[PDB]
Ligand binder design. Structure first.
Ligand SMILES: Cc1cnc(C)n2nc(CCc3nc(N4CCCC4=O)cn3C)nc12
Ligand SMILES: [Mg+2]
Ligand SMILES: [Zn+2]
Length: 312
Protein backbone atom coordinates (compact mmCIF):
# COMPACT_ATOMS: atom_id res chain seq x y z
CA UNK A 1 0.00 0.00 0.00
CA UNK A 2 0.84 3.78 0.13
CA UNK A 3 3.27 4.99 2.81
CA UNK A 4 3.96 8.71 3.05
CA UNK A 5 7.79 9.22 3.02
CA UNK A 6 9.64 12.46 3.79
CA UNK A 7 13.04 13.70 2.58
CA UNK A 8 15.95 12.32 4.65
CA UNK A 9 16.48 15.42 6.88
CA UNK A 10 12.71 15.55 7.77
CA UNK A 11 12.49 11.73 8.16
CA UNK A 12 15.26 11.92 10.86
CA UNK A 13 14.50 15.26 12.58
CA UNK A 14 10.63 14.72 12.74
CA UNK A 15 11.37 12.14 15.51
CA UNK A 16 13.06 14.79 17.72
CA UNK A 17 10.99 16.98 20.06
CA UNK A 18 12.57 20.26 18.74
CA UNK A 19 11.54 19.64 15.07
CA UNK A 20 10.21 22.77 13.28
CA UNK A 21 7.69 21.86 10.51
CA UNK A 22 9.17 24.53 8.15
CA UNK A 23 7.66 27.34 6.05
CA UNK A 24 6.19 25.12 3.24
CA UNK A 25 2.43 25.01 4.13
CA UNK A 26 1.76 22.43 1.36
CA UNK A 27 3.99 19.85 3.15
CA UNK A 28 2.13 20.11 6.56
CA UNK A 29 -0.78 17.79 5.59
CA UNK A 30 1.74 15.15 4.41
CA UNK A 31 3.76 15.62 7.63
CA UNK A 32 0.57 14.98 9.74
CA UNK A 33 -0.41 11.83 7.71
CA UNK A 34 3.18 10.54 8.15
CA UNK A 35 2.87 11.07 11.96
CA UNK A 36 -0.54 9.27 12.13
CA UNK A 37 0.79 6.37 10.03
CA UNK A 38 3.84 5.83 12.32
CA UNK A 39 2.22 6.58 15.75
CA UNK A 40 -1.18 4.92 15.03
CA UNK A 41 -0.78 2.68 11.89
CA UNK A 42 -1.65 2.88 8.13
CA UNK A 43 -4.94 1.08 9.13
CA UNK A 44 -6.20 3.64 11.80
CA UNK A 45 -7.99 5.85 9.19
CA UNK A 46 -9.07 5.54 5.53
CA UNK A 47 -6.54 7.79 3.67
CA UNK A 48 -9.23 9.54 1.49
CA UNK A 49 -11.43 10.37 4.56
CA UNK A 50 -8.33 11.50 6.56
CA UNK A 51 -7.08 13.77 3.70
CA UNK A 52 -10.63 15.28 3.40
CA UNK A 53 -10.77 15.79 7.24
CA UNK A 54 -7.24 17.46 7.32
CA UNK A 55 -8.18 19.87 4.48
CA UNK A 56 -11.52 20.93 6.15
CA UNK A 57 -9.65 21.42 9.44
CA UNK A 58 -7.07 23.61 7.66
CA UNK A 59 -9.90 25.64 6.05
CA UNK A 60 -11.43 26.34 9.50
CA UNK A 61 -8.15 27.83 10.92
CA UNK A 62 -7.97 31.60 10.35
CA UNK A 63 -5.14 33.79 9.03
CA UNK A 64 -4.13 35.10 12.51
CA UNK A 65 -0.49 35.64 13.61
CA UNK A 66 -0.15 32.70 16.10
CA UNK A 67 -3.35 30.59 16.57
CA UNK A 68 -3.28 29.30 12.96
CA UNK A 69 -2.89 26.10 10.99
CA UNK A 70 0.94 26.04 11.53
CA UNK A 71 0.32 26.10 15.32
CA UNK A 72 -2.21 23.20 14.95
CA UNK A 73 0.34 21.07 13.07
CA UNK A 74 3.25 22.07 15.43
CA UNK A 75 1.16 21.01 18.50
CA UNK A 76 0.33 17.65 16.73
CA UNK A 77 4.07 17.04 16.06
CA UNK A 78 4.96 17.54 19.78
CA UNK A 79 2.18 14.99 20.72
CA UNK A 80 3.63 12.59 18.07
CA UNK A 81 7.10 12.88 19.68
CA UNK A 82 5.59 12.24 23.17
CA UNK A 83 3.61 9.20 21.87
CA UNK A 84 6.64 7.74 19.99
CA UNK A 85 8.93 8.00 23.10
CA UNK A 86 6.26 6.22 25.28
CA UNK A 87 5.35 3.32 22.90
CA UNK A 88 3.57 1.07 25.41
CA UNK A 89 1.86 3.62 27.76
CA UNK A 90 -1.12 4.52 25.50
CA UNK A 91 -4.26 2.69 24.29
CA UNK A 92 -5.09 2.37 20.53
CA UNK A 93 -7.98 4.89 20.93
CA UNK A 94 -5.68 7.41 22.72
CA UNK A 95 -3.12 7.24 19.82
CA UNK A 96 -6.08 7.84 17.35
CA UNK A 97 -7.72 10.60 19.45
CA UNK A 98 -4.76 12.71 20.66
CA UNK A 99 -3.21 13.56 17.22
CA UNK A 100 -6.71 14.61 16.04
CA UNK A 101 -7.27 16.60 19.23
CA UNK A 102 -3.93 18.41 18.70
CA UNK A 103 -4.81 19.20 15.02
CA UNK A 104 -8.31 20.44 16.07
CA UNK A 105 -7.53 22.10 19.47
CA UNK A 106 -7.64 25.79 18.27
CA UNK A 107 -10.18 25.35 15.39
CA UNK A 108 -11.71 28.69 14.27
CA UNK A 109 -9.56 30.73 16.75
CA UNK A 110 -10.03 34.49 16.19
CA UNK A 111 -6.75 35.60 17.92
CA UNK A 112 -8.57 36.70 21.14
CA UNK A 113 -8.54 35.31 24.72
CA UNK A 114 -11.60 33.97 26.62
CA UNK A 115 -11.29 37.15 28.75
CA UNK A 116 -11.62 39.44 25.64
CA UNK A 117 -14.76 37.53 24.44
CA UNK A 118 -16.42 38.03 27.93
CA UNK A 119 -15.55 41.77 28.05
CA UNK A 120 -16.72 42.29 24.40
CA UNK A 121 -19.85 40.22 25.31
CA UNK A 122 -19.32 37.91 22.27
CA UNK A 123 -22.23 35.46 21.71
CA UNK A 124 -19.77 32.52 22.37
CA UNK A 125 -19.37 33.94 25.99
CA UNK A 126 -23.17 33.33 26.54
CA UNK A 127 -23.18 29.84 24.93
CA UNK A 128 -20.01 28.77 26.94
CA UNK A 129 -19.37 30.57 30.23
CA UNK A 130 -15.98 28.92 30.94
CA UNK A 131 -13.23 27.67 28.66
CA UNK A 132 -15.20 29.66 26.00
CA UNK A 133 -12.89 29.21 22.97
CA UNK A 134 -12.04 25.60 23.96
CA UNK A 135 -15.71 24.54 23.96
CA UNK A 136 -16.00 26.29 20.55
CA UNK A 137 -12.93 24.37 19.19
CA UNK A 138 -14.47 21.02 20.30
CA UNK A 139 -17.86 22.01 18.76
CA UNK A 140 -16.03 22.84 15.46
CA UNK A 141 -14.27 19.44 15.62
CA UNK A 142 -17.62 17.55 15.91
CA UNK A 143 -19.11 19.68 13.04
CA UNK A 144 -16.28 18.68 10.69
CA UNK A 145 -16.44 14.95 11.79
CA UNK A 146 -20.16 15.08 10.75
CA UNK A 147 -19.57 16.48 7.20
CA UNK A 148 -20.16 13.91 4.38
CA UNK A 149 -17.06 11.71 3.74
CA UNK A 150 -15.23 13.14 6.88
CA UNK A 151 -16.05 10.48 9.50
CA UNK A 152 -12.49 9.16 10.07
CA UNK A 153 -13.74 7.16 13.15
CA UNK A 154 -16.53 5.43 11.07
CA UNK A 155 -15.11 1.88 11.79
CA UNK A 156 -15.24 2.26 15.65
CA UNK A 157 -18.27 0.83 17.60
CA UNK A 158 -20.79 3.32 19.16
CA UNK A 159 -18.93 2.96 22.55
CA UNK A 160 -15.34 3.32 21.08
CA UNK A 161 -16.49 6.33 18.98
CA UNK A 162 -18.01 7.78 22.24
CA UNK A 163 -14.74 7.08 24.12
CA UNK A 164 -12.54 8.67 21.35
CA UNK A 165 -14.76 11.84 21.19
CA UNK A 166 -14.61 12.02 25.02
CA UNK A 167 -10.73 11.76 24.92
CA UNK A 168 -10.75 14.59 22.27
CA UNK A 169 -13.25 16.76 24.26
CA UNK A 170 -11.17 16.49 27.48
CA UNK A 171 -7.79 17.00 25.64
CA UNK A 172 -9.17 20.14 23.97
CA UNK A 173 -10.78 21.66 27.15
CA UNK A 174 -7.40 20.98 28.91
CA UNK A 175 -5.71 23.49 26.53
CA UNK A 176 -7.47 26.29 28.47
CA UNK A 177 -4.31 27.47 30.29
CA UNK A 178 -6.58 28.73 33.21
CA UNK A 179 -7.22 25.01 34.02
CA UNK A 180 -3.53 23.94 33.73
CA UNK A 181 -2.33 25.39 37.12
CA UNK A 182 -4.73 23.31 39.23
CA UNK A 183 -4.25 20.19 37.08
CA UNK A 184 -0.44 20.36 37.39
CA UNK A 185 -0.71 20.87 41.27
CA UNK A 186 -2.99 17.79 41.54
CA UNK A 187 -0.59 15.74 39.40
CA UNK A 188 2.42 17.03 41.49
CA UNK A 189 0.73 15.92 44.83
CA UNK A 190 -0.30 12.54 43.28
CA UNK A 191 3.22 11.87 41.91
CA UNK A 192 4.97 12.72 45.28
CA UNK A 193 2.55 10.91 47.68
CA UNK A 194 2.73 7.91 45.23
CA UNK A 195 -1.08 7.82 44.58
CA UNK A 196 -0.56 8.48 40.79
CA UNK A 197 -2.23 5.50 39.07
CA UNK A 198 -2.32 5.19 35.23
CA UNK A 199 -5.17 2.55 35.41
CA UNK A 200 -7.30 5.22 37.11
CA UNK A 201 -9.25 6.87 34.25
CA UNK A 202 -9.50 10.26 36.06
CA UNK A 203 -5.66 10.07 36.56
CA UNK A 204 -4.99 9.32 32.85
CA UNK A 205 -7.30 12.28 32.07
CA UNK A 206 -5.08 14.61 34.14
CA UNK A 207 -1.79 13.19 32.55
CA UNK A 208 -3.31 13.69 29.01
CA UNK A 209 -4.34 17.23 30.06
CA UNK A 210 -0.71 17.99 31.01
CA UNK A 211 0.57 16.47 27.69
CA UNK A 212 -1.92 18.84 25.95
CA UNK A 213 -0.47 21.86 27.83
CA UNK A 214 3.14 20.63 27.08
CA UNK A 215 2.34 20.31 23.34
CA UNK A 216 0.43 23.62 23.25
CA UNK A 217 3.40 25.54 24.86
CA UNK A 218 6.03 23.65 22.75
CA UNK A 219 7.40 26.86 21.07
CA UNK A 220 9.49 27.24 24.33
CA UNK A 221 11.12 23.77 23.56
CA UNK A 222 12.45 24.66 20.07
CA UNK A 223 15.90 25.89 18.96
CA UNK A 224 16.38 29.45 20.21
CA UNK A 225 15.85 31.15 16.75
CA UNK A 226 12.44 29.34 16.42
CA UNK A 227 11.48 30.21 20.05
CA UNK A 228 12.41 33.90 19.61
CA UNK A 229 10.56 34.34 16.23
CA UNK A 230 7.47 32.40 17.45
CA UNK A 231 7.36 34.84 20.49
CA UNK A 232 6.91 37.76 18.02
CA UNK A 233 3.78 35.97 16.56
CA UNK A 234 2.47 35.30 20.13
CA UNK A 235 2.84 39.00 21.03
CA UNK A 236 1.42 40.23 17.67
CA UNK A 237 -1.87 38.58 18.75
CA UNK A 238 -1.71 39.75 22.41
CA UNK A 239 -1.03 43.39 21.42
CA UNK A 240 -3.89 43.41 18.85
CA UNK A 241 -6.18 42.21 21.73
CA UNK A 242 -4.61 44.98 23.89
CA UNK A 243 -5.66 47.50 21.21
CA UNK A 244 -9.23 46.00 21.23
CA UNK A 245 -9.27 46.24 25.08
CA UNK A 246 -8.34 49.96 24.77
CA UNK A 247 -11.25 50.40 22.25
CA UNK A 248 -13.65 49.02 24.91
CA UNK A 249 -12.05 51.65 27.27
CA UNK A 250 -10.27 48.90 29.38
CA UNK A 251 -6.52 49.04 30.24
CA UNK A 252 -5.15 45.69 29.00
CA UNK A 253 -2.93 43.57 31.31
CA UNK A 254 0.78 44.30 30.64
CA UNK A 255 1.06 41.05 28.55
CA UNK A 256 -1.25 42.64 25.87
CA UNK A 257 -0.01 46.28 26.04
CA UNK A 258 2.37 46.97 23.08
CA UNK A 259 3.49 50.07 25.09
CA UNK A 260 5.49 47.53 27.24
CA UNK A 261 7.37 45.99 24.19
CA UNK A 262 10.61 46.66 26.16
CA UNK A 263 9.66 44.42 29.15
CA UNK A 264 9.12 41.36 26.87
CA UNK A 265 12.35 39.63 28.07
CA UNK A 266 11.22 39.90 31.75
CA UNK A 267 7.64 38.78 30.77
CA UNK A 268 9.21 35.63 29.23
CA UNK A 269 11.20 34.90 32.47
CA UNK A 270 7.97 35.02 34.57
CA UNK A 271 6.22 32.79 32.02
CA UNK A 272 9.07 30.20 31.92
CA UNK A 273 9.27 30.14 35.78
CA UNK A 274 5.45 30.28 36.48
CA UNK A 275 4.16 28.19 33.54
CA UNK A 276 6.56 26.38 31.17
CA UNK A 277 9.30 24.91 33.49
CA UNK A 278 6.78 23.53 36.03
CA UNK A 279 4.80 22.02 33.10
CA UNK A 280 7.79 20.11 31.59
CA UNK A 281 9.20 19.29 35.08
CA UNK A 282 5.96 17.45 36.16
CA UNK A 283 5.61 15.88 32.67
CA UNK A 284 9.21 14.53 32.90
CA UNK A 285 8.51 12.99 36.38
CA UNK A 286 5.38 11.22 35.05
CA UNK A 287 6.83 10.36 31.57
CA UNK A 288 10.61 10.20 31.90
CA UNK A 289 11.33 10.01 28.12
CA UNK A 290 9.88 13.60 27.66
CA UNK A 291 13.00 15.04 29.40
CA UNK A 292 14.32 16.57 26.09
CA UNK A 293 11.34 19.02 26.33
CA UNK A 294 12.39 20.17 29.87
CA UNK A 295 16.05 20.44 28.83
CA UNK A 296 15.16 22.63 25.73
CA UNK A 297 12.85 24.81 27.87
CA UNK A 298 15.65 25.35 30.43
CA UNK A 299 18.00 26.21 27.46
CA UNK A 300 15.51 28.86 26.21
CA UNK A 301 15.01 30.30 29.76
CA UNK A 302 18.79 30.81 29.89
CA UNK A 303 18.63 32.56 26.42
CA UNK A 304 15.97 35.06 27.74
CA UNK A 305 18.26 35.55 30.74
CA UNK A 306 21.11 36.35 28.31
CA UNK A 307 18.79 38.84 26.55
CA UNK A 308 18.05 40.68 29.86
CA UNK A 309 21.87 40.83 30.64
CA UNK A 310 22.36 42.48 27.19
CA UNK A 311 24.65 39.51 26.11
CA UNK A 312 22.08 38.93 23.22
C1 LIG B 1 0.41 31.36 26.27
C2 LIG B 1 1.90 31.51 25.88
C3 LIG B 1 2.56 30.55 25.24
N1 LIG B 1 3.86 30.59 24.90
C4 LIG B 1 4.58 31.69 25.17
C5 LIG B 1 6.01 31.84 24.70
N2 LIG B 1 3.98 32.76 25.83
N3 LIG B 1 4.51 33.99 26.22
C6 LIG B 1 3.48 34.53 26.81
C7 LIG B 1 3.42 35.88 27.36
C8 LIG B 1 4.33 35.86 28.66
C9 LIG B 1 4.21 37.19 29.30
N4 LIG B 1 4.68 38.30 28.78
C10 LIG B 1 4.30 39.26 29.63
N5 LIG B 1 4.65 40.58 29.44
C11 LIG B 1 5.36 41.10 28.34
C12 LIG B 1 5.77 42.56 28.79
C13 LIG B 1 4.87 42.91 29.92
C14 LIG B 1 4.35 41.59 30.40
O1 LIG B 1 3.74 41.31 31.43
C15 LIG B 1 3.58 38.80 30.68
N6 LIG B 1 3.53 37.44 30.49
C16 LIG B 1 2.91 36.47 31.38
N7 LIG B 1 2.37 33.75 26.85
C17 LIG B 1 2.65 32.65 26.22
MG1 LIG C 1 -6.28 27.45 22.50
ZN1 LIG D 1 -3.03 26.10 20.94
Amino acid sequence: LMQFTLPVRLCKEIELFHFDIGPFENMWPGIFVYMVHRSCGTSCFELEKLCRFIMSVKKNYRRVPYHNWKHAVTVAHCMYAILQNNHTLFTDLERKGLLIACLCHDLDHRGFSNSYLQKFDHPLAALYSTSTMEQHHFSQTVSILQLEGHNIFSTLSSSEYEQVLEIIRKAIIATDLALYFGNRKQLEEMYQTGSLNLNNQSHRDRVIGLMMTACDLCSVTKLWPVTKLTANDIYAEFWAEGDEMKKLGIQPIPMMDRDKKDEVPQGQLGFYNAVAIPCYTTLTQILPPTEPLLKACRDNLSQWEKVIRGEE
